[PDB]
Design a protein around this ligand. Structure first.
Ligand SMILES: [Hg+2]
Ligand SMILES: [Hg+2]
Ligand SMILES: [Hg+2]
Ligand SMILES: [Hg+2]
Ligand SMILES: [Hg+2]
Lengths: 23, 223, 224, 225, 215, 224
């Protein structure tokens, strides 16, 4: 209910950083 | 842009319009309750400065004679006087005082609750705006993965619209969220201080009534 | 395809989604039921306060409040004051009567509050764990995706985009179930606050009438 | 592999986060069950005692209705406390005193009993707040060792590191599975403990009212014989 | 680059400037008044009467706090001249003093709101800066035809600096806010102690005088 | 890899984040241990003294039971405070007065003791408040170093990004280890301080009762 912002943003960068490569 | 932001989705466009509406509500509340608050506070500080010179309760009713029918201090003074008239003939002063305070303080409390009407909106908007924005972004990157599932072209020009609408969702979430919370906090501070000032004028009335009752009851005893 | 998206998930993420949909259903049921109940009771109380504000005494109040029907709250408060006057018949100490009445009336108000907040715990808890249940949906989902990329080798072509899309739909539904619970709970706190305030004002009116009348009666019989 | 192997195959730190979180869940359920049986017995027992003492109208009748409620009964303890304040105060002419001294006593025990009911609530609240975050530490340590792994040799081809990311996300999953029940159990314990404190407060208020009424009626009744 | 990101960062830096201005000025205020109050309390520890207290504090200075409390009690004694009810005076005096302390409390915490909000919303305004930036970058890769993110990487880093500045502006605001909360706590405590002494002395003297004129 | 390596292997900024957060964890646990043994002592001894004073049918019996307690004991300070208010008020005909002044003093002392117990809570509260921001700054530094890596190498591979993301996740891991214990320890100290202030309040209530009872029995006893 608070960190959930920070949690989901960090998760979304762990999802998007693999979206970065390659192809 | 009107064509750019309207491009490719329903739900995300709806969170966008919702959050911008929320920002509109916060700022409309801001201006209207701002003019109201400044007016009433100015008036109250004037009235307290005037009533500070009253050596009794009658002098207070004279200083407040012209204060106006919607003024608060005339409402408090009228409450005290009305409690004196309803108690006419009572031998127990220790009582009268009690009944007066209970009335006055509650009036203040009521005005307090009348000050915070609408502050619930600011509190809720600042509370859920980052979460509604977060739903916007999660919906966005979800639509991105749907996009790479259809075409199967992997990267990187296909993921782009989804990531765009996601970061727009977070951006709008913060722009609606921050001003709501800041304005709410200043409203907590100001409502606290104003409730306090009203308490100070009420306390002046209570003091004058008590002191005069004591001087009257003691004045016809010995002399 | 929505049906295909769903068919891409897992059995656990399925429990997460049906669970969140049920939780949203119950929150809306609570909202409608306790909402109609609360509006009815509030309008009734406002009517009664508007009537009782004109009573110059306690006999005049008991008369204005004749009915008011039965289950009304103001009739219950007036009846509590009356019951304390009747139990104290023959007591010479009026300070006592007064004291005892407040102790009851005040406390009665509190009980009303506890009966108003019965069931709001549900909203608070649903809004509390809904993002956590959604988040569990997504992490379990994405875990299944990475295991999938583990048993098949080289790279992952398209295989789990949809699994991941369904996890993210789990968080999306989690927030969609969570938010209305929290908003509804806050409006219920505000409205219950105002309700306790109004009822508190009626109780205070009864208390004032009792004190003033006992004082004037004792003073009128303290000189002929 | 499957879930069991995925546990046995993970790192040592992540193993500890997972085992810890299951332990917290175990404590969550033990607390839940024992406090459940306790609170239900005591709450409906107290509901009875309140229903019976509502007829007292006296405080001699209250001691008589409560004459056998049990040596652990709460209403018997409150009634005995008021009575003990009447006995220690034998010979006081100031009733305004006795009442005060009585109230101060009674309202002091209720709170204490309340504070004894909430003993252990710290664990439920703390587990429900922390468990997702300790899990989050588990996975972040996991994927951190993984990315240290992919720049060593240094590898590519994501399918080679995927077991590490799985076995890390398992920690957040377990964190949430331990976390959620703690939160629900804590919420019902707050509300129910609230209702119990209220009920006990209602019995205590009955005792105080009866005592006040007796002191007033005795003092007024022996003022005009 | 861009526009918004730089205005967001300069906004954060201005917020940092305000953080340090509050830090210094409030530092001077709290230290001075805390010292003055400590001395005044040690001196009033010699009071065996209310008159001896009004006397020890006569010259404390006109802006002294203890002279304001003592002067309020004395003024309530002068306005009540001719009253037979000592239980009355006591009440009114307490009520008066109970406002004083609160008002002074409310006046010491006038500025902590700024520090609190700056430390609370600084990381989020910074985050808005970077999210606007990276949104502009991916909007950039959505035109023409692209791949290989190495082209937009600098823009994204430049965005992440906005959050870095947000957090760096937030930290001193938060630490300073906590220290000022503690100091105001101790101050409200001291002021409350001096008020409590005035109330005791007044109550005790009214009791001993009233009991002396009953015999 | 291992820990010491992970340190010597990293940047200067993440080096400062690691040293800062590691220090913050050290102070957090030191506070915990010293204030824990202290709090255990204070509760143990105070509970002992309360058991002894429970036999007091009179305030004089309390002062006699409390004669040898300790020079720094809290119960002796309360009983001594009551004694001091009885002595300053000697000769007063208003007992209702004495009682007031006595309660006023005693129930202030308890509060003050509370603020001395929370004399250390500021550090824990602040450490738990700023640890996630310092950690988050570390991680953002990491991901930024990653995008610089993709800016130099012009590569987009996984192994040029890996060091920056690994550093970021390191900042996050240590950030959580510094942040969580500060918060739980702070709340556990609030809970324990509450219980302690409450217990001391109970002893104060015993003193107040004994005083009020004795003053009533004396004033009533000489009339006759
Ligand atoms: Hg819409
Ligand atoms: Hg489930
Ligand atoms: Hg372990
Ligand atoms: Hg600018
Ligand atoms: Hg360093």
């Amino acid at each position: 209910p608070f960190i959930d912002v920070m949690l989901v943003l960090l998760i979304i960068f762990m999802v998007a950083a693999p979206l970065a490569t390659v192809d | 842009v009107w064509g750019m932001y309207q491009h490719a989705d329903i739900v995300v466009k709806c969170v966008m319009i919702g959050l911008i509406l929320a920002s509109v509500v916060t700022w409309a509340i801001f201006f209207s309750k701002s003019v109201e608050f400044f007016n009433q506070k100015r008036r109250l500080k004037r009235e307290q400065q005037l009533l500070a010179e009253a050596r009794s309760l009658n002098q207070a009713n004279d200083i407040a004679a012209d204060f106006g029918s919607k003024s608060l201090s005339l409402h408090l003074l009228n409450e005290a006087q009305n409690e004196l008239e309803l108690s006419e003939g009572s031998d127990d002063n220790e009582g009268i005082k009690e009944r007066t305070s209970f009335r006055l303080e509650r009036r203040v409390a009521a005005v307090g609750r009348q000050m915070g009407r609408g502050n619930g909106y600011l509190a809720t908007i600042g509370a859920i705006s980052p979460f509604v924005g977060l739903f916007g972004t999660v919906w966005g990157i979800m639509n991105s993965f749907i996009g790479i599932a259809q075409t199967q072209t992997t990267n990187l020009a296909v993921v782009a619209p989804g990531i765009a609408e996601a970061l727009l969702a977070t951006a709008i979430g913060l722009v609606a969220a921050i001003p709501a919370v800041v304005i709410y906090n200043v409203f907590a501070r100001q409502i606290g201080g104003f409730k306090a000032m009203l308490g100070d004028v009420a306390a002046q009335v209570l003091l004058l009534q008590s002191r005069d009752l004591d001087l009257e009851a003691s004045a016809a005893a010995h002399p």
